[PDB]
Amino acid sequence: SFPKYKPSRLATLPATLDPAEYDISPETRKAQAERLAIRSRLKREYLLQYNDPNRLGVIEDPALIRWTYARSANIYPNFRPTPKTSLLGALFGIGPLFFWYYVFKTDRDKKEKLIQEGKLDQTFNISY
Amino acid sequence: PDSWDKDVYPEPPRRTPAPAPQTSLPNPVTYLTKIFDLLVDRPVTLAREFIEQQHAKNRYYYYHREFRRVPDITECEEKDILCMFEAEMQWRRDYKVDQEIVNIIQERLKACQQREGESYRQNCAKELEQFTQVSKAFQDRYSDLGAHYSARKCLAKQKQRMLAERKAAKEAAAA
Amino acid sequence: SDAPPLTLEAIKDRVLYVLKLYDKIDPEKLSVNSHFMKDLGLDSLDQVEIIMAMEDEFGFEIPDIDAEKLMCPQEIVDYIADKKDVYE
Amino acid sequence: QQERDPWYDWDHPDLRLNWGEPIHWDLDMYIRNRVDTSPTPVSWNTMCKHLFGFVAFMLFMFWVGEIYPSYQPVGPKQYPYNDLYLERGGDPTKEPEPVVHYEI
Amino acid sequence: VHIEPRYRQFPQLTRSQLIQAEFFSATMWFWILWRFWHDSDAVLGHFPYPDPSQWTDEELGILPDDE
Amino acid sequence: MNPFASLTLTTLTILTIPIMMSNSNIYKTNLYPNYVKTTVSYAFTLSLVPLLMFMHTGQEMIISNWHWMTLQTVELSLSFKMDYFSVMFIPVALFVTWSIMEFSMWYMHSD
Amino acid sequence: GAHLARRYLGDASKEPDPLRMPTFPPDYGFPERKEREMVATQQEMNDAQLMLQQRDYCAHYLIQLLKCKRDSFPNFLACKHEQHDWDYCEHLDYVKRMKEFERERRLLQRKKRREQREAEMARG
Amino acid sequence: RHSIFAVTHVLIPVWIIHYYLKYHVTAKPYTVVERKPRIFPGDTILETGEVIPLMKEFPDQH
Amino acid sequence: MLKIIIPTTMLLPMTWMSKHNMIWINATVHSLLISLISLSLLNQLGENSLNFSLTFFSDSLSAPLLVLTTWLLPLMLMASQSHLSKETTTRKKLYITMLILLQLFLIMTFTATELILFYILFEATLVPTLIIITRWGNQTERLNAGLYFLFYTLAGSLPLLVALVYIQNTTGSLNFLIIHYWSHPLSNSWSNIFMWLACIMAFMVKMPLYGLHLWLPKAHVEAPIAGSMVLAAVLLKLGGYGMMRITTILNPLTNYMAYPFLMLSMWGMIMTSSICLRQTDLKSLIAYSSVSHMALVIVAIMIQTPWSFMGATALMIAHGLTSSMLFCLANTNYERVHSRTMILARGLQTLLPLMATWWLVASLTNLALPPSINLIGELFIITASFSWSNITIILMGMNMMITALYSLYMLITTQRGKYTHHINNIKPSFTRENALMALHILPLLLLTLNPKMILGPLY
Amino acid sequence: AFSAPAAYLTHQQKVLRLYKRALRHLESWCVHRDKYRYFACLMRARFDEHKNEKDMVKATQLLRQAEEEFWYGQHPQPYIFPESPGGTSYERYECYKVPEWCLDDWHPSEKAMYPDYFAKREQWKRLRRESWEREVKQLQEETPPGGPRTEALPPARKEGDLPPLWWHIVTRPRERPM
Amino acid sequence: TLCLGAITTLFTALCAITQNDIKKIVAFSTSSQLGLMMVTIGINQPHLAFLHICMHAFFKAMLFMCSGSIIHSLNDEQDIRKMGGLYKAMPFTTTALIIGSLALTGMPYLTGFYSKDLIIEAVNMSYTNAWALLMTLIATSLTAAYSTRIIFFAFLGKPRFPPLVLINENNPLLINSIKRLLIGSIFAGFIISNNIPPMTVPNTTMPLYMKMTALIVTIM
Numbered sequence A: 001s002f003p004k005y006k007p008s009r010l011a012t013l014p015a016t017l018d019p020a021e022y023d024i025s026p027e028t029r030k031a032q033a034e035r036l037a038i039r040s041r042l043k044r045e046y047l048l049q050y051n052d053p054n055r056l057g058v059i060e061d062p063a064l065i066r067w068t069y070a071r072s073a074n075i076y077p078n079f080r081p082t083p084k085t086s087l088l089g090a091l092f093g094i095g096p097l098f099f100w101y102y103v104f105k106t107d108r109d110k111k112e113k114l115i116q117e118g119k120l121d122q123t124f125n126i127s128y
Numbered sequence B: 001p002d003s004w005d006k007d008v009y010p011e012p013p014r015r016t017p018a019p020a021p022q023t024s025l026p027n028p029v030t031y032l033t034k035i036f037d038l039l040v041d042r043p044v045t046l047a048r049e050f051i052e053q054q055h056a057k058n059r060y061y062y063y064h065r066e067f068r069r070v071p072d073i074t075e076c077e078e079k080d081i082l083c084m085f086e087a088e089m090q091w092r093r094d095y096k097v098d099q100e101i102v103n104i105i106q107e108r109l110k111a112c113q114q115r116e117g118e119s120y121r122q123n124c125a126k127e128l129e130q131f132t133q134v135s136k137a138f139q140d141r142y143s144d145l146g147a148h149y150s151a152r153k154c155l156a157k158q159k160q161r162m163l164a165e166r167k168a169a170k171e172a173a174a175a
Numbered sequence C: 001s002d003a004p005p006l007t008l009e010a011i012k013d014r015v016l017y018v019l020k021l022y023d024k025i026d027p028e029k030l031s032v033n034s035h036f037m038k039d040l041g042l043d044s045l046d047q048v049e050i051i052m053a054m055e056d057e058f059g060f061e062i063p064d065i066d067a068e069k070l071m072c073p074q075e076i077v078d079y080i081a082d083k084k085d086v087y088e
Numbered sequence D: 001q002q003e004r005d006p007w008y009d010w011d012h013p014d015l016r017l018n019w020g021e022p023i024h025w026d027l028d029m030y031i032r033n034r035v036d037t038s039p040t041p042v043s044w045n046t047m048c049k050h051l052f053g054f055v056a057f058m059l060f061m062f063w064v065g066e067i068y069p070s071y072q073p074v075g076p077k078q079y080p081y082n083d084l085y086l087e088r089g090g091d092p093t094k095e096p097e098p099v100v101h102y103e104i
Numbered sequence E: 001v002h003i004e005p006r007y008r009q010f011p012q013l014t015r016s017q018l019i020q021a022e023f024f025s026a027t028m029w030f031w032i033l034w035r036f037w038h039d040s041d042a043v044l045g046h047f048p049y050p051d052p053s054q055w056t057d058e059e060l061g062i063l064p065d066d067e
Numbered sequence F: 001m002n003p004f005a006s007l008t009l010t011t012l013t014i015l016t017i018p019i020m021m022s023n024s025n026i027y028k029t030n031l032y033p034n035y036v037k038t039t040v041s042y043a044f045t046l047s048l049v050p051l052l053m054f055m056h057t058g059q060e061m062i063i064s065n066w067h068w069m070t071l072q073t074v075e076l077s078l079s080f081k082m083d084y085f086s087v088m089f090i091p092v093a094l095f096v097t098w099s100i101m102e103f104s105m106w107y108m109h110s111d
Numbered sequence G: 001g002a003h004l005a006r007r008y009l010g011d012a013s014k015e016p017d018p019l020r021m022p023t024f025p026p027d028y029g030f031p032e033r034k035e036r037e038m039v040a041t042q043q044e045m046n047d048a049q050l051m052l053q054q055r056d057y058c059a060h061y062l063i064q065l066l067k068c069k070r071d072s073f074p075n076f077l078a079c080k081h082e083q084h085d086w087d088y089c090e091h092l093d094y095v096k097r098m099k100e101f102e103r104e105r106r107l108l109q110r111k112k113r114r115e116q117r118e119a120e121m122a123r124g
Numbered sequence H: 001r002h003s004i005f006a007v008t009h010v011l012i013p014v015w016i017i018h019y020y021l022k023y024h025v026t027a028k029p030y031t032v033v034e035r036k037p038r039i040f041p042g043d044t045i046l047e048t049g050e051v052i053p054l055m056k057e058f059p060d061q062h
Numbered sequence I: 001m002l003k004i005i006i007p008t009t010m011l012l013p014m015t016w017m018s019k020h021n022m023i024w025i026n027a028t029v030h031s032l033l034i035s036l037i038s039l040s041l042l043n044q045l046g047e048n049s050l051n052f053s054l055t056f057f058s059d060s061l062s063a064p065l066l067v068l069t070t071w072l073l074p075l076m077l078m079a080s081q082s083h084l085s086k087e088t089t090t091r092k093k094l095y096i097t098m099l100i101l102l103q104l105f106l107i108m109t110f111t112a113t114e115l116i117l118f119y120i121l122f123e124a125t126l127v128p129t130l131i132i133i134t135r136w137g138n139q140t141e142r143l144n145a146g147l148y149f150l151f152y153t154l155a156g157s158l159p160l161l162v163a164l165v166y167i168q169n170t171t172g173s174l175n176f177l178i179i180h181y182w183s184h185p186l187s188n189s190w191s192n193i194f195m196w197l198a199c200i201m202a203f204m205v206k207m208p209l210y211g212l213h214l215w216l217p218k219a220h221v222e223a224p225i226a227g228s229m230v231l232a233a234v235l236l237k238l239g240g241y242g243m244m245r246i247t248t249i250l251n252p253l254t255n256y257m258a259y260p261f262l263m264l265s266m267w268g269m270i271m272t273s274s275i276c277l278r279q280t281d282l283k284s285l286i287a288y289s290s291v292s293h294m295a296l297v298i299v300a301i302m303i304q305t306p307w308s309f310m311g312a313t314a315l316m317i318a319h320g321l322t323s324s325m326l327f328c329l330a331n332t333n334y335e336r337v338h339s340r341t342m343i344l345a346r347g348l349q350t351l352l353p354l355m356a357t358w359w360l361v362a363s364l365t366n367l368a369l370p371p372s373i374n375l376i377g378e379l380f381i382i383t384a385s386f387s388w389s390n391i392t393i394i395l396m397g398m399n400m401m402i403t404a405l406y407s408l409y410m411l412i413t414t415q416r417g418k419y420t421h422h423i424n425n426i427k428p429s430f431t432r433e434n435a436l437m438a439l440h441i442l443p444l445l446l447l448t449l450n451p452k453m454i455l456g457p458l459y
Numbered sequence J: 001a002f003s004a005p006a007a008y009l010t011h012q013q014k015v016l017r018l019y020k021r022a023l024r025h026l027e028s029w030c031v032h033r034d035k036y037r038y039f040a041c042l043m044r045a046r047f048d049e050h051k052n053e054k055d056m057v058k059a060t061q062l063l064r065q066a067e068e069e070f071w072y073g074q075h076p077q078p079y080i081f082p083e084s085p086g087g088t089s090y091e092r093y094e095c096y097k098v099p100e101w102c103l104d105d106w107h108p109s110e111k112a113m114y115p116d117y118f119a120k121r122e123q124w125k126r127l128r129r130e131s132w133e134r135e136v137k138q139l140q141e142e143t144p145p146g147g148p149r150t151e152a153l154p155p156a157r158k159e160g161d162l163p164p165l166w167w168h169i170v171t172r173p174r175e176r177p178m
Numbered sequence K: 001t002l003c004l005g006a007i008t009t010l011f012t013a014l015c016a017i018t019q020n021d022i023k024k025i026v027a028f029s030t031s032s033q034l035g036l037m038m039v040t041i042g043i044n045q046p047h048l049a050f051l052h053i054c055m056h057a058f059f060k061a062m063l064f065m066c067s068g069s070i071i072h073s074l075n076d077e078q079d080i081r082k083m084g085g086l087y088k089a090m091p092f093t094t095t096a097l098i099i100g101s102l103a104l105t106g107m108p109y110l111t112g113f114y115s116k117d118l119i120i121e122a123v124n125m126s127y128t129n130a131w132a133l134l135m136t137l138i139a140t141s142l143t144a145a146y147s148t149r150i151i152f153f154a155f156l157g158k159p160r161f162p163p164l165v166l167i168n169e170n171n172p173l174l175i176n177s178i179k180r181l182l183i184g185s186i187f188a189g190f191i192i193s194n195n196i197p198p199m200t201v202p203n204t205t206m207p208l209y210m211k212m213t214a215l216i217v218t219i220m
């Protein structure tokens, strides 16, 4: 009927346009109940410390600690030299350096051989 | 005033016109000028008069330091460290004086561009030409020396230029 | 300065005002304690139109999960009061 | 994080996170001060077409209007003293070529 | 000046805001009419635009195509 | 000395005084916004005078009052250009700021 | 616009180009042409500091207007005759430029008409 | 206490600035530069008492 | 130079013979007094350096660095005495002794007349720093950090030792004056290429050059607060000072031996600035920012112009003050909440307003707002680089943008939004912390008034 | 905002939410009150047309194609109440909300001002301290062995009991705290 | 500079005519006027461009202050779809916003007129990019359209705001500030234009249709 909306990476699919939430089976409902239970157990564990009168300080969150550890210290132990890893490393590591070397060396060679010719308009250029 | 030399910092004779009113209306600028005068310029002048009265009572002076002329780097032999030291200090002082000369010329140029108004492109040509001559000379003497410059590098630059000029004149004489 | 602090009494007068301006509700037989579906004979869509009228009244939007349960005028009064921090 | 329910009672309301819940690897990229992935009214790949088309059309038309300028049916403005030769930088010792205008 | 809300009725107005609003609107219109009475040229143009086809070739200096 | 430079510099100078008084007792009171507004209105009425001088005789000036630093052939100085653009834009901006500060005293009353 | 329509859609060969104009000598069709004169000296325009684009053949009326504005300063509405005079001089300058444009256009049309039709009388 | 604001916020600062400009800043070359004043045909100089002659008898297209 | 040095040494027994409850007071008072006396080295002759004796001399390059060192010591004492309160008297005296020995080694290194003495002191600075990091570091990771800091540094500095003794065998002297006056060009040969590399790589790893920078996040993050302060403010500047001194014997080879280091420094400027945008640790972010700033200094030194040397001096000083201030600001919050994660504590402006002002000012000087001396140095370097090649503006321009981005990102993440609900132990700011921030900030602002003092010898 | 969510929405809840969204976006399109009122009655009618459908499958497909229609025809710029999650005043006063525990770090000279407020605060703190253990015990009593199942909390049931986990709900800062 | 200015004025004007937030509309109007300033810099009319900067300050600040009085009276609401008949409820704000809208659109003998009508005249009569000129004219029409949208939506019709009417503009601070900028928006153009030396060689000779181009476009 109406023109369709196609999702992408930076503009995802709305929930009401998701065929998965309109095709419900009992296993889906049991999964949703399990998720709610997990959310509930975590919420109670947090609220029992949050409302505690005798508790002074910062409640520590193991999920945050896991996130920072995974983002910093767990990365190298899980690294393998792979065709993808090696090629991406070489590219993003030394490609730009040689690109910029070519650019700057070319520019400065042009300028110097232009100075040797007596042709650059260098009048008034005392400061450098 | 007379404090600074008007030959180094010159300015034209400062022609200003006479007021030629054309209307019966009062000029608010001149009334404001009288008000400003008698509220600001007179108390300030009196304060300055008292300050200079107190200054005259205790008058003391300072003297510009004069420096002899020692041998330059061309007449120092290759490993004589004392002649080299004095020549390098002299060359550095001369470099500083040349920077200040270029500064004076640039001040003249800027003052002219501001003063001449809409006619600066024609009325400041002599200032521009003077700057061009000074800038060319300063550039030959010190440009491309780099940091870690020295009298020896300035001498090497001069000698390279002199060789090129001599060879050019020699092959022009064969023409 | 801006508007005077809301008083439960002004709130409840206003909710009753909008409720008797509703055509499906009998004015001479509506009370602050009248159930919408049970006593006044409305359905869910009538109740939705009623919450939307209440947001139009008080100039602030009510979340769907919370509304599902505002089934009498007193509940709407309590919701608005506890939301806008009125004790009297 | 902008896609999450704003009406839920989060432990961290502005972050929209709950204590003890797994955190996305790219949380700091998605904090909603930053990259937003919320669904849009018009499809991606349709916004892109319209934007690129508008900009390309404007550039093409500006280049065209550069080839085909607008002007008035007038002659070049005339200036008295050899086109103000001494005024526009001078050099008063080199005898400019006479620029002389005639009445009409 | 104490004005209190009114709940579904047109708000309470003071005489001062009405007189000031009407005075300034009338001032704008008077100014426009005064200017257009004195400077109608700035809107309608002052000098006539010439028509180039009204121009003889004697004043314009072209010869009659035989030379 | 010619008034033109003194007034153009005082116009900008007096605007810094309520900032200097920021740590003072006046800031902690409810009289501070009115004080800033009054300062800005006085700055506007003062900047009106150099505008008159320019509109009469076309007076323009540059003031290099303080030398900051000099790098070999380049001199950096605190310098002010007081041409047509400056003397015409200063009173306009001061007038608009005066109006918007008087407006703010009402709009932002409960902040 | 009509000149732009004629130049860009019609045969552009028959329309003057605003950048390169005039291409014909100033004495071509005229027997005698009086060369335009100046009322203001270079020194006057330099002492007035007019502007380098206001130093056209109308600059004496501009000096009139400027001196009269400075003279009757508080009454900023007293310089009406001077403003009208400068405007009128500028308008006459502009119609002179328009005559130059029109003169150039006719010559090009006339030259093409005579040259290629003498080619006509030479082809048979 | 009626006119106490205009004396400490306008009068005192302009005393310090005018003193500073008149005796310190203008004690050095090229610190305050004013574009030279316009001259018109028929103007009279104040210093020399010169008179610049008027401007060449307009064609008078009245 | 003896007048500055002996009192610094005196500080040692003064702290060892002080009563248990007066160590901080005594050390702070007399450190400040020493800083005041040092302030007198800023009077410079002009044409040449002040040569006190055969062993020591001061320069316009040197004078700013010495004043910054002496001024940094009392600030380190103020920052340390909070987290060291539970420590025994003997260990507190040992910590203060480490800081004093570090100051003593640093003062001597900057003023040594010849390279071998400079090398010995420049290397002696390693021991107290390593002891501070590994003994008083909070985390387990400090041991690894110490090893990284040591080994990266020695792997660069030992070839320098070989090169220096070789140079004295061939030239007859390592005295810096003789080295300068008798300078001769370096030919283009493999021997000279490797001599250049051995003369340059130690200072490169000290800066640090991009790609040899991995020791710095470790060491600067795992160190106690005073260790981090001295590592960022002063110890990074040893590389710049040494390079500025040593590049006098390297001409004309530098003309093309500098290409790879310039490429590394410009691209890695972009790289480390981008890294700062995705950082979960707040100290890690400040460390990488330091790297980005020192890349700019490396470019300035490699292109060898008077404007670039002036900019490098100004940027070194300004960075030293700003980076120390940022580390202290982060440490206050860490002391509150005992975690370095940046999103743990949010909306701190609602709870600590004056500390939020300090945060804003530090973030504004980090992004080089005019007319701060951070921007003076950065602008001078950017102009010299433009003269060197007009295409550098693209890289320089990009770096300016990313720096503003991550600076304001840090400010917004830590100070704005709403406070984390659970953390309720955020007490008001102490007078000690506010005074520490002010004593960082006031000197920087004061420096803007007299720019020439931090400009250097070229000025 | 105040109610514990459920594991899922029923078909009826989805339908009511779509009804409300369609009405709000229609009001955004239909600016004036009369025209909106007309088209809103037409909407209610078109909604009532399928009110008494018994086939769940066809009802689901009706809901799905209705959602597709809403998405294609939604307003790109719907009206939002100013303090709602997209409003222009949404979180405007969050910078003024200070937690109550900050009051314990006040200097004694600051608490010298306001003696009555702080006496009453000490009373509130006594109340919380003397209720906490009963709250914890009650929550342990009324909760299944496999942890809680929803985010719902029980009320008080005894004589002088308080509803468990009440302190941070009762002592919210305010919504216009300054 | 001319091309950049031309695209900017047209694009901002185009975005403004469909916005529902009042501040967004006035901000897009500001972007459009800045684009116009850039096109008049592009045709080598710097003095003319400067004059517009001075002229536009008055009435655009006044427009924002009027929008602010509306927003505060209507309980911090900024969507024009919930602003009804304020032409009578807020008489002074209405007068001021109407005068500011007439100054923005270049009504004759007003502050906007000297600055904008001269700019359109100079863009019409210069050797200029044709696409830039066309976009400038379309933007001049767009300006009239957005101004119309604000007035029609915010001041005419029946009320569309909540029933607790708190409308009150009887505060001397608001009235005095807005009246000050109102007198500015009415007379500053004339006074300033007549009190400065002429830096521009005026366009005295142009076809009548070209002369009425700004007016014709605005009425359309």
Ligand SMILES: CCCCCCCCCCCCCCCCC[C@@H](O)O[C@H](CO[C@H](O)CCCCCCCCCCCCCCC)COP(=O)(O)OCC[N+](C)(C)C
Pocket (backbone or CB within 6 Å): I188, I189, I190, I193, I210, I211, I212, I257, I260, I261
């Ligand atoms: C991750 C960060 C690490 C730190 C970065 C260290 C950077 C070190 C790089 C050194 C810069 C250049 C070194 C020498 C300059 C030129 C090199 C050579 O390739 O140039 C040509 C040299 O020709 C050939 O290339 C010979 C060299 C090839 C053999 C070297 C192997 C290079 C492979 C890369 C290995 C990576 C090295 C770094 C290890 C980490 C020039 O031709 P030619 O004029 O005839 O020789 C000049 C010398 N003369 C005058 C004495 C004759």
Ligand SMILES: CCCCCCCC/C=C\CCCCCCCC(=O)O[C@H](COC(=O)CCCCCCC/C=C/CCCCCCCC)COP(=O)(O)OCCN
Pocket (backbone or CB within 6 Å): I151, I152, I153, I154, I155, I156, I159, I162, I163, I166, I190, I191, I192, I194, I195, I197, I198, I199, I201, I205, I212
């Ligand atoms: C933390 C990481 C830092 C790593 C730094 C490593 C690079 C350091 C620079 C090179 C180190 C060795 C240089 C040698 C010291 C200079 C001495 C010298 O100049 O003498 C040369 C001698 O030159 C050499 O012998 C050097 C050859 C190299 C031997 C050791 C190779 C080690 C690896 C070399 C490449 C690595 C250098 C750059 C790496 C940087 C770090 C990544 C000439 O003397 P003569 O023998 O008399 O020759 C003329 C008379 N016939």
Ligand SMILES: CCCCCCCCCCCC(=O)SCCNC(=O)CCNC(=O)[C@H](O)C(C)(C)COP(=O)(O)O
Pocket (backbone or CB within 6 Å): C043, C044, C045, J011, J012, J015, J016, J022, J025, J026, J029, J046, J047, J048, J050, J051, J052, J053, J054, J059, J060, J062, J063, J066, J069, J070, J073, J074, J075
């Ligand atoms: C401009 C903005 C875009 C607008 C476009 C939107 C298009 C909408 C078109 C119409 C949508 C439909 O018909 S959707 C078709 C869905 N069909 C059914 O739901 C049938 C079964 N009925 C029930 O389950 C309940 O009776 C219930 C109805 C929920 C009420 O319950 P209460 O009484 O207990 O509250």
